[PDB]
């Protein structure tokens, strides 16, 4: 039995025609206090997988170490560690899913919501979710926390079902993700303006973008809003 | 100690072609103990029919209350109350007890004597009107009734066909609920004739 | 305080014919008032012509299916590739569930297939392992909606022969695979209308002596 | 714990420790059992090189396992006490769970099973 | 919330963020927490949105009725009416209000009224959840008899930090300037204040 | 308080009520009459919370007697039962409700019919051929379902009632010290002294 | 519920879904959540259904009496003030969450009211369980100087976001357009994107299927 | 549940209902509440369904192991005590079981043992177990005599379950009958309450509370 | 379980134990013997939590019988009572204690004296002329204080015991279905069949 202390908010993601996109802001909140601002919550595993983590940061750092150690262990007595026997997104996910469910079953969970985004060796897009309860699910768009409530509706307008994935380009997909991150900054009280974004493409590979900022924000209309009902000044 | 499921019981109402049906089970119990198999839950004030599920004392009290009010209505208005009007009266009366409510699930059914239109309506315990073209359900087997009605129901049924549909909806719903059953009554209501039928059902 | 359980919604439905059996389930996966996935299958082919679904808390559902699938694998290893009969599978599943009697799998489990006489079989389990063979069973969130409809349409309950004064019952008979699929589709569209956790898609697994076939149908997405 | 396999097979297929245990029995005082038509009688030898004995308190050769079953023996006296004790405990345990006293065959089968266990358990003779 | 009121040479300036929250959801990102109870008597609202609105509305009614009979009320009088409501109904209120006004005799005045319903007359006042993070900064930087531009910068820099650290604060920085000249509304957007 | 039974037969209503008054680990009395005559042809038995039972019974008794004097006329059992139900229905939403369950056995002189009404503390009224309150019903209802016939005589009803009391004396945990039996018919109310 | 309000050039538009729930059960598939306070002041209500209806009718009644007393068309701020003071008095126990909008001699207005009595002002607002889905759309597509047709599109799109993504919302989209100098147009079932598909089978029973014990004519006449 | 079993001149009658509930939800009307342990032993089930089902089929395995080891069918006393000692180990853990171990052996004759989940074990001639036990007692006790015929005893057992099925909301479905003799148990059919109630009402003239 | 009494007289110990086994609102049995013979001249009655009572009684019985076989000798009532007390004293600080109260009536053959020991579930032992467990004591102790004499015969003790049972049958709330009476003396243990 735990309670989360230092926390990370929404992780959002979606599939597009050649791969997957995933994003998460760089904030480590301490309750209402916006304590840490240089926190990277997207963690690449190899050149084909990115694990996005929300929830307790101490448990996130533990998971980082497990993934780091998984890469080391996979390399042992493995001449094809950088080829046919490299770590797949599906292997990494299933490992995490096993751990999450084992920990919830011992009544001592890793207090996290996790999205594993990547591209399989055969080119297939991989995007699957797992959380502190060991619950798992997959969808063309996946999001955690407030992202589930606000990002998914926006991302589902682009990719509403499986057949919409081949029709969605990386330009359109990234635009929707970046727009969603702005909406979350407007509306989530534990979000920051700064964020990271990762693209895993079956052709161009892993592109990790750091120090992005929410921009093109609408605030001008605020000047016209006076009082809370009557008041004219 | 959940007032709405101490005594048990169910009511269902349906519309058809120039007709309406309202049906109810006959059980009154005290939790596991079945007490009465004659406890009817449908009443009528003129041509307007009211079914009431939930706490049996409140079922009785509200019947007596609406008889009281519809009688005064008729004396002053010099005409029988209509289903649409009665529905509003039920809603007002229930909401009057907003923070000390009657633990009931009433269902209005009837045909407007002027327009000839079939009318049904349902309420929650504090008076929210739930109007419906097709059907209204209420009671301890409301989930079961929702499932039965949603699948079995079709629009514009003739009075004789509508009888079969509503009866099968109630019977099969009641048999999946421990606190409902022990007999059943069905009212088939046409513009100027009303038929009341008692159904044969399993007595466990 | 940490709550180890959750509700992933959805509903499942098993019907048995004369020489076949179907196990249906919607593909919607939810938590609270949010949709997690519109297509997340929870009806699985477990081998030996046994299909299985464990509906409720998905983490426990997957864990169970995973363990039973593994049980089928080891049954082959330990008993010279012998086919696991549906009755033997059912008893095995009881022990899986009851093994966690004091920290239960939060699921309604249903399996379907053929018995050793080639006839359609459906077995259903409570969360802690009590099981029963039936012609008919609905499980999950909309079970209370669908089940009475099945009593009426599959087992002809409360239906008497017209004109016999309610004395002669409507005689029991096996339904064709065409008629069963009609009842499954109507059951799920009705459940979708009146239950918020049910919708998106319907996936049916049909089991005959020839193997396991699949059928998919769209459901309302609201 | 002491683990040594003391009872083991020899080239000719004999377990010498079990066979040497029989020699201890052969050394022990003679015991005889004769069953009649409606009774059983257990006779036992007591060696007469021991005078100045106190026969009131000296352990008797025949022991009651329950009110209806008796056990005599030949061989090591100290070893017999362990078997008798176990047998007496099992007798009461049987009455407790089966609500019926042991049969003579059952009690024998138990005692025999104990003896066997000591022929292929590590660290024991 | 993060709110503050600061007296200066020509009068007083009120300042506030624009965030209203339900848990961690921002129900309103363009809220106006600076409210008029009289021509040149305003207040900053923190705590329950419903309670502070209900209080402000009653105070505005009282001061309007006061004005009809006895002419313009003092800022002290306005603070007293706020206090009376907050103190007598302390069991049923969650309201932290800063009252600020401009007399011609008394010039700029600031009164703060915390949860208990006590009254405290100060040179400047800070309040709301985000105020905790700027006690150190404001104490070190506040000076009496500042100019308009210095006071605007003081409030802007202060609320900028409060907003930066407090999750319950954000959006735009609204300000209201109270002087003999009149009433001036100011607004400052994230793109400006965030990078201070 | 605990056991109150009622059986309506062809020409009468028979009420049986336990004699025990128990408090803590002491049976304080074994001859308690848990009934009040409301009118010459109407009898009410009662069971429930201590104090409430008698206070309620006598309050109803006074009201019915007041009515009888005012109108020089006896209220029908149906009318009395409706009056009692309404009082309990008021009571349940009071500051302190009457925790009293009652049976009303009456003979309607206008209809020439016996009538038995069962009313609980919530104000839940039902007319029945046979009734019970508390745990008694869990044994007696099934027993009466089997042995009861609507055309029975008063003597047959008393034998049917003996069968109930015997079953209760066999299977009930508590010693209720037997019952006082009273009969309501066209000639009024009388007590059976040897039961 | 999902409800929204959007301001435009010459007025204001409000919209709502039409699902009414009872736990996880859809009680009403087409209920009206748009309420008329006065001819040109309309209200969208979320929360406790009886409370939203009762509070909107009470204030609507008092607004009519006020209008007749003052010989003036009612103002939105009057409805706003009367609603909030009523709701505040009851300390949130009356679970009415309202979006109040309308046109009056002062102009066009858009407000929201919460159960505890707090009011908000905005150009775009959303309330109810699907408000986050709706607000996401509103935050993504809203702009200053919307036309009538653009505001209706934006409003209905925001409701749709709730319909599809929120389990608490569903069925149809109701709209009401309040433009200055014109009559308010109430667009009941403006969109119907959740029509029930044809059933696979008719469940019309053969006459005489149900076993009957008694028949009798009921007297409704005097 | 309602279950009973009573001893009489011609052996043992065992009768049970077939309902299974989850709160007020009627989950099944066709549950087998009698377990056939061997040709001479029966076990009845009431309480938590799998607790009863699991441990009574486990009991059957233990009884089989006894006759393999001892070359003799287990006594009713010993069989009941295996179950009572098992549940006693789980006492406080929350098992919910009301069972009756009924059977015949040479040394014992016809024997019934009541065994429940808080460790109570009782030999007796009559027992009724379950939520509707009191309803069954009312009819059974008032009509019971030792000198009942096999035909009358079977009917009384059936009629007592019917009585409980009717009044108890958590009993119903159908009646399963068994008769235990010196030659073993004999099944006497599944009797649906749907038809049985009306058949009994008409022929017997009882159930006058119900609208005929 | 409920009523267990014990009376030590001149030459014997008399134990009386109620026959009722009640569960919920049903008396499941009315002929239950709440006692076990530990040895030929030692008898233990018991009352308390369901299951625990018999399980504990039989466990003690097995141990004493085991001792008797091992030593070919009967333990004194004092020795048995000390053994039982220690077991309960261990039990009370266990994970799940035996909730069982006992009376041990024995005849010491070496002393030629009857002995009655009262031991509760905590392991509280006392030797007494007369004893009781549960609510019984609240009536019987004062009654025996008055009527008991140390030099009474077995027949006088049985009449004294009848006086207790009558008082309990009059004033106790629950129907305990009479008692089984057993006598422990120099000739061993025997049951009184007509009480
Ligand atoms: C900062 C945020 C904190 O100091 C500011 O002070 C602002 C003040 C401005 C807006 C005037 N405060 C808030 O935004 C305020 C924070 C708050 C919340 C609860 C108690 C005190 C202060 N937020 C509110 O008042 C919101 C406004 C609504 C969303 C328009 N109201 C709520 O959150 C209400 C509060 C009800 C209440 C509780 C205790 C005392 C008084 C009122 N709660 C809900 O609506 C219930 N909500 C349902 C969903 O589950 C979470 C709870
Ligand atoms: C979306 C769906 C959710 O936000 C919308 O907000 C809609 C608003 C529209 C319909 C105006 N909200 C609902 O549909 C609303 C959701 C809800 C439920 C419960 C509490 C608060 C909100 N549903 C209702 O209000 C239903 C109305 C239907 C048509 C009957 N009412 C109930 O479910 C009532 C609750 C009444 C209540 C009393 C006291 C305090 C709060 C609420 N509940 C029942 O009827 C349940 N039960 C039935 C059996 O008898 C006992 C009562
Ligand atoms: C009469 C009919 C009533 O008691 C009998 O006693 C029968 C005995 C027969 C079946 C052997 N008893 C029941 O039917 C018994 C009643 C009961 C329920 C719970 C505890 C004790 C007694 N019912 C069950 O055991 C049902 C079995 C059927 C197949 C549904 N099982 C449940 O209710 C399960 C498991 C309950 C449980 C016991 C111990 C630990 C954990 C759980 N619970 C659910 O299925 C939960 N529920 C189903 C509906 O969907 C929401 C979740
Ligand atoms: Cl505000
Ligand atoms: Mg029943
Ligand atoms: Mg939806």
């Amino acid at each position: 039995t735990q309670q989360p202390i230092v926390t990370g908010t929404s992780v959002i993601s979606m599939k597009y025609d050649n791969g997957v996109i995933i994003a998460a802001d760089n904030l480590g909140s301490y309750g209402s206090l916006l304590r840490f601002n240089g926190v990277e919550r997207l963690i690449p595993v190899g050149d084909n997988t990115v694990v996005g983590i929300s929830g307790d940061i101490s448990d996130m750092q533990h998971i980082e170490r497990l993934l780091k150690d998984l890469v080391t262990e996979n390399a042992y007595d493995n001449p094809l560690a950088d080829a046919e026997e490299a770590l797949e997104p599906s292997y990494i996910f299933e490992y995490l899913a096993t751990v999450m469910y084992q920990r919830r079953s011992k009544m001592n969970p890793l207090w996290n919501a996790i999205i594993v985004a990547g591209v399989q060796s055969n080119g297939d897009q991989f995007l699957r979710y797992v959380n502190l309860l060991g619950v798992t699910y997959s969808s063309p768009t996946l999001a955690t926390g407030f992202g589930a409530h606000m990002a998914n509706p926006l991302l589902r307008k682009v990719v509403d079902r499986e057949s919409d994935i081949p029709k969605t380009t990386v330009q359109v997909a990234e635009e929707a993700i970046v727009n969603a991150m702005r909406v979350l900054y407007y509306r989530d009280a534990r979000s920051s303006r700064n964020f990271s974004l990762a693209i895993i493409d079956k052709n161009t590979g892993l592109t990790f973008k750091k120090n992005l900022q929410v921009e093109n924000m609408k605030w001008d209309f605020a000047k016209d809003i006076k009082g809370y009902g009557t008041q004219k000044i | 100690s959940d007032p709405s499921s101490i005594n048990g019981g169910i009511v269902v109402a349906m519309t058809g072609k120039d007709c309406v049906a309202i049906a109810c089970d006959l059980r009154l119990g005290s939790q596991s103990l079945g007490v009465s198999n004659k406890f009817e839950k449908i009443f009528h004030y003129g041509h307007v029919f009211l079914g009431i599920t939930g706490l049996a004392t409140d079922v009785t009290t509200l019947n007596e209350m609406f008889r009281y009010k519809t009688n005064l209505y008729k004396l002053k208005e010099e005409r029988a109350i209509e289903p649409e009007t009665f529905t509003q009266l039920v809603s007002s009366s229930l909401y009057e007890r907003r923070f000390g409510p009657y633990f009931v699930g009433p269902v209005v059914a009837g045909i407007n004597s002027k327009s000839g239109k079939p009318f049904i309506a349902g309420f929650d315990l504090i008076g929210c009107i739930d109007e419906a073209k097709d059907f209204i359900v209420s009671g301890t087997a409301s989930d079961q009734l929702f499932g039965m009605c949603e699948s079995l129901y079709e629009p514009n049924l003739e009075p004789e066909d509508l009888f079969e549909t509503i009866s099968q909806a109630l019977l099969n719903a009641a048999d999946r609920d421990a606190l409902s059953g022990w007999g059943a009554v069905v009212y088939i209501i046409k513009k100027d004739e009303v038929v009341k039928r008692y159904l044969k059902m399993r007595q466990d | 305080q940490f709550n180890p359980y959750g509700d992933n919604g959805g509903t499942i439905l098993g019907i048995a014919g004369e020489d076949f059996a179907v196990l249906a389930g919607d593909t919607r996966n939810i938590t609270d008032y949010s949709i997690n996935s519109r297509y997340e299958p929870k009806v699985f082919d477990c081998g030996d012509n046994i299909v299985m679904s464990a509906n409720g808390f998905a983490a426990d559902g997957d864990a169970l299916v995973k363990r039973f699938k593994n049980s089928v694998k080891w049954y082959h290893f330990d008993h010279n590739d012998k086919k696991l009969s549906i009755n033997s599978a059912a008893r095995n599943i009881q022990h899986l569930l009851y093994g966690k009697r004091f920290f239960p799998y939060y699921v309604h489990t249903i399996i379907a297939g053929l018995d050793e006489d080639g006839k359609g079989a459906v077995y259903s389990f409570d969360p802690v392992g009590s099981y029963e063979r039936e012609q008919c069973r609905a499980g999950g969130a909309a079970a209370s909606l669908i089940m009475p409809f099945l009593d009426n349409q599959v087992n002809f309950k409360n239906q008497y022969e017209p004109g016999t004064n309610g004395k002669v019952k409507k005689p029991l008979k096996y339904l064709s695979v065409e008629e069963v699929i009609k009842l499954v589709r109507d059951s799920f569209t009705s459940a979708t209308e009146r239950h918020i956790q049910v919708g998106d898609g319907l996936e049916i697994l049909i089991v005959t002596k020839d193997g396991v076939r699949k059928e998919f149908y769209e459901l309302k997405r609201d | 714990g002491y683990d040594r396999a003391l009872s083991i097979f020899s080239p000719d297929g004999h377990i010498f420790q079990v066979e040497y245990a029989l020699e201890a029995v052969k050394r022990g005082t003679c015991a005889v059992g004769v069953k009649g038509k409606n009774c059983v009688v257990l006779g036992c030898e007591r060696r007469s090189t021991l005078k100045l004995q106190d026969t009131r308190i000296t352990p008797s050769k025949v022991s009651k396992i329950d009110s209806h079953v008796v056990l005599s023996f030949s061989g090591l006296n100290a070893d017999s006490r362990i078997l008798i004790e176990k047998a007496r405990v099992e007798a009461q345990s049987h009455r407790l769970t089966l609500e019926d006293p042991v049969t003579v065959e059952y009690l024998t089968r138990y005692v025999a099973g104990v003896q066997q266990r000591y022929t292929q358990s590590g660290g024991v003779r | 919330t993060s709110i503050m009121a600061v007296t200066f040479k020509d009068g007083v300036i009120l300042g506030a963020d624009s965030r209203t929250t339900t848990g961690a959801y921002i129900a309103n990102r363009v809220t106006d927490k600076l409210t008029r109870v009289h021509d040149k008597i305003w207040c900053c609202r923190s705590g329950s949105a419903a309670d502070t609105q209900a209080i402000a509305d009653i105070v505005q009614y009282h001061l309007e009725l006061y004005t009809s009979q006895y002419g313009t009320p003092s800022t002290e009088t306005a603070a007293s009416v706020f206090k009376e409501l907050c103190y007598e109904n302390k069991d049923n209120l969650t309201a932290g209000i800063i009252v600020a006004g401009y007399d011609d005799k008394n010039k700029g005045e600031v009164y703060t009224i915390p949860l208990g319903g006590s009254v405290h007359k100060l040179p400047y006042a800070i309040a709301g959840s985000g105020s905790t993070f700027i006690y150190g900064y404001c104490d070190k930087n506040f000076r009496e008899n500042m100019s308009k531009e210095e006071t605007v910068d003081f409030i802007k820099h202060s609320l900028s930090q409060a907003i930066k650290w407090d999750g319950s604060s954000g959006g735009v920085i609204r300000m209201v300037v109270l002087t003999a000249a009149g009433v001036e509304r100011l607004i400052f957007y994230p793109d400006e204040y965030e990078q201070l | 308080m605990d056991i109150i039974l009622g059986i309506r037969v062809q020409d009468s209503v028979i009420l049986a009520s336990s004699k025990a008054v128990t408090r803590g680990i002491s049976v304080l009395k074994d001859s308690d009459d848990k009934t009040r005559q409301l009118s010459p042809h109407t009898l009410m038995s009662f069971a429930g919370e201590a104090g409430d039972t008698v206070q309620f019974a006598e309050y109803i008794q006074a009201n019915i007697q007041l009515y009888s004097i005012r109108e020089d006329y006896e209220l029908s059992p149906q009318a009395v039962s409706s009056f009692v139900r309404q009082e309990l229905a008021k009571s349940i939403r009071s500051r302190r409700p009457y925790q009293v369950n009652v049976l009303i056995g009456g003979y309607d002189k206008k209809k020439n019919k016996p009538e038995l009404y069962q009313i609980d503390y919530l104000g839940t009224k039902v007319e029945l051929p046979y009734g019970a309150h508390g745990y008694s019903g869990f044994y007696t209802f099934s027993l009466l379902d089997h042995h009861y016939r609507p055309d029975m005589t008063t003597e047959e009803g008393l034998d049917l009632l003996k069968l109930c009391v015997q079953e209760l004396e066999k299977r009930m945990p508590m010693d209720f010290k037997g019952v006082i039996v009273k009969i309501v018919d066209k000639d009024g109310i009388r007590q059976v002294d040897d039961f | 519920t999902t409800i929204v309000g959007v301001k435009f050039n010459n007025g204001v538009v409000i919209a709502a879904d039409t699902r009414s729930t009872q736990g996880p059960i859809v009680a009403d598939k087409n209920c009206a959540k748009l309420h008329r306070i006065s001819p040109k002041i309309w209200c969208a209500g979320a929360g406790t259904a009886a409370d939203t209806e009762a509070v909107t009718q009470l204030i609507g009644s008092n607004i009519e009496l006020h209008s007749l007393y003052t010989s003036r068309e009612p103002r939105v701020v009057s409805a706003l003030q009367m609603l909030k003071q009523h709701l505040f008095k009851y300390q949130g126990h009356i679970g009415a969450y309202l979006i109040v909008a309308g046109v009056d001699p002062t102009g066009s207005h858009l407000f929201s009211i919460h159960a505890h009595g707090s009011t908000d002002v905005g150009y775009y607002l959303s309330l109810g369980s699907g408000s986050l889905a709706a607000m996401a759309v509103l935050e993504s597509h809203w702009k200053q100087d919307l036309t009538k047709e653009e505001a209706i599109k934006l409003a209905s799109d925001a409701i749709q976001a709730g319909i599809w993504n929120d389990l608490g919302s569903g069925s149809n989209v109701d709209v009401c357009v309040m433009e200055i100098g014109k009559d308010a147009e109430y667009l009941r079932n403006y969109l119907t994107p959740n029509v029930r598909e044809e059933k696979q089978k008719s469940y019309k029973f053969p006459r005489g299927t149900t076993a009957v014990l008694k028949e009798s004519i009921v007297n409704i006449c005097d | 549940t309602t279950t009973l079993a009573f001893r009489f001149q011609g052996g043992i009658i065992v009768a049970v209902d077939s309902r299974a509930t989850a709160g007020n939800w009627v989950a099944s009307q066709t549950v087998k509440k009698v377990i056939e342990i061997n040709p001479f032993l029966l076990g009845t089930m009431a309480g938590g369904a799998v607790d009863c089902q699991f441990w009574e089929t486990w009991l059957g395995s233990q009884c089989r192991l006894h006759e393999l080891r001892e070359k003799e069918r287990i006594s009713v006393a010993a069989a009941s005590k295996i179950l009572s000692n098992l549940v006693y180990q789980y006492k406080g853990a929350g098992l919910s079981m009301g069972t009756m171990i009924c059977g015949y052996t040479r040394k014992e004759g016809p024997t019934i043992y009541y065994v429940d989940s808080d460790g109570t074990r009782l030999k007796g001639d009559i027992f009724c177990v379950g939520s509707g036990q009191t309803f069954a007692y009312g009819v059974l006790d008032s009509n019971y005599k030792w000198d009942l015929s096999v035909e009358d005893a079977l009917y009384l057992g059936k009629r007592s379950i019917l009585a409980a099925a009717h009044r108890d909301a958590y009993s119903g479905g159908s009646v399963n009958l068994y008769h235990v003799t010196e030659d073993g148990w004999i099944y006497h059919g599944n009797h649906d309450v749907g038809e049985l109630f009306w058949k009994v009402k008409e022929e017997e003239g009882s159930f006058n509370n119900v609208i005929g």
Side-chain angles (χ1 to χ4, degrees), chain D residues 94-100 103 105-106 109, chain H residues 66 69-70 75 77-78 81 85 107 113 121:
Chain D
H94 191 273
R95 294 168 88 98
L96 195 65
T97 52
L98 287 305
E99 294 200 334
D100 205 31
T103 59
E105 192 276 328
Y106 180 91
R109 167 156 40 92
Chain H
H66 175 92
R69 284 194 275 261
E70 306 307 317
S75 67
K81 202 156 197 185
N85 288 174
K107 63 147 288 188
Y113 273 93
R121 181 165 162 278

Side-chain angles (χ1 to χ4, degrees), chain F residues 14-129:
Chain F
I14 310 164
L15 298 190
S17 309
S18 52
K19 292 194 276 178
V21 178
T22 304
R23 206 204 131 108
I25 59 164
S26 297
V27 181
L28 300 174
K29 199 176 174 181
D30 61 4
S31 65
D32 185 53
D33 195 0
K34 297 168 177 54
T35 205
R36 295 299 147 112
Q37 183 176 131
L38 308 183
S39 70
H41 301 100
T42 303
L43 184 68
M44 187 172 73
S45 64
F46 46 84
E49 174 65 17
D52 285 356
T53 47
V54 176
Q55 283 287 165
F56 179 76
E58 293 183 5
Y59 165 72
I60 295 299
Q61 187 179 48
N63 274 105
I64 302 303
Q65 286 177 4
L66 177 59
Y67 192 103
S68 293
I69 286 290
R70 185 186 296 118
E71 310 303 332
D72 192 25
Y73 198 73
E74 183 173 20
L75 241 26
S76 67
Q78 200 291 129
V80 172
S81 70
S82 293
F83 172 79
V84 169
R85 195 204 81 82
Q86 194 184 54
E87 288 297 310
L88 292 165
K90 285 183 202 165
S91 177
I92 197 62
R93 291 174 197 283
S94 304
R95 190 183 56 76
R96 199 179 61 76
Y98 283 114
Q99 291 184 59
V100 184
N101 301 315
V102 302
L103 298 171
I104 293 168
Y107 192 90
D108 195 338
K109 295 284 280 178
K110 308 211 81 168
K111 289 181 168 186
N112 290 301
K113 269 181 160 64
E115 284 175 358
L116 176 67
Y117 296 97
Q118 187 180 135
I119 310 168
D120 74 359
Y121 74 102
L122 302 172
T124 312
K125 191 180 92 175
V126 176
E127 202 281 325
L128 294 170

Side-chain angles (χ1 to χ4, degrees), chain A residues 151-162:
Chain A
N152 272 334
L154 296 169
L155 304 178
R156 283 163 186 175
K157 287 170 78 78
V158 181
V159 280
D160 207 30
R161 69 263 314 290
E162 196 73 9

